[PDB]
């Protein structure tokens, strides 16, 4: 719950949104627009949508009180992807790559 730990989270979030990772991060930038994409079963399968723009809003609004709450939202975003999409799908390979970025930097959390 320290300021320092939340700044580490904010750094991770900025990195996930940065051009460095855009080739595989872009499916996670905005909420899944199920209607626009023709995914009429998406909200029957995914109970708690999450995406990086929502994480960013919650960070800016000071919604997150500790790093664990932030990590749970980021991991929820990936979990939704793993739930809705077959494991051999391109978007799942992108999720795995971005989650690799997230988990290895999140592990460097200041104590």
């Amino acid at each position: 719950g320290s300021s320092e730990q939340l700044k580490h989270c904010n750094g991770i979030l900025k990195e996930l949104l940065s051009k460095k990772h855009a080739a595989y991060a872009w499916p996670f930038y905005k909420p899944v627009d199920a209607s626009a994409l023709g995914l009429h079963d998406y909200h029957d399968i995914i109970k708690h949508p999450m995406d990086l723009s929502t994480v960013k809003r919650k960070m800016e609004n000071r919604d997150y009180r500790d790093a664990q709450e932030f990590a749970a939202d980021v991991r929820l975003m990936f979990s939704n992807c793993y739930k809705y999409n077959p494991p051999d799908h391109d978007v799942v390979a992108m999720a795995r790559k971005l989650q690799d970025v997230f988990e290895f930097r999140y592990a460097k959390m200041p104590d």
Binding site: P27, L37, G38, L39, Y84, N85, P86, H89, D90, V91, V92, M94
Partner: peptide, 6 residues
């Protein structure tokens, strides 16, 4: 099965 291929 999931989204359209990206």
């Amino acid at each position: 099965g999931g989204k359209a291929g990206k």
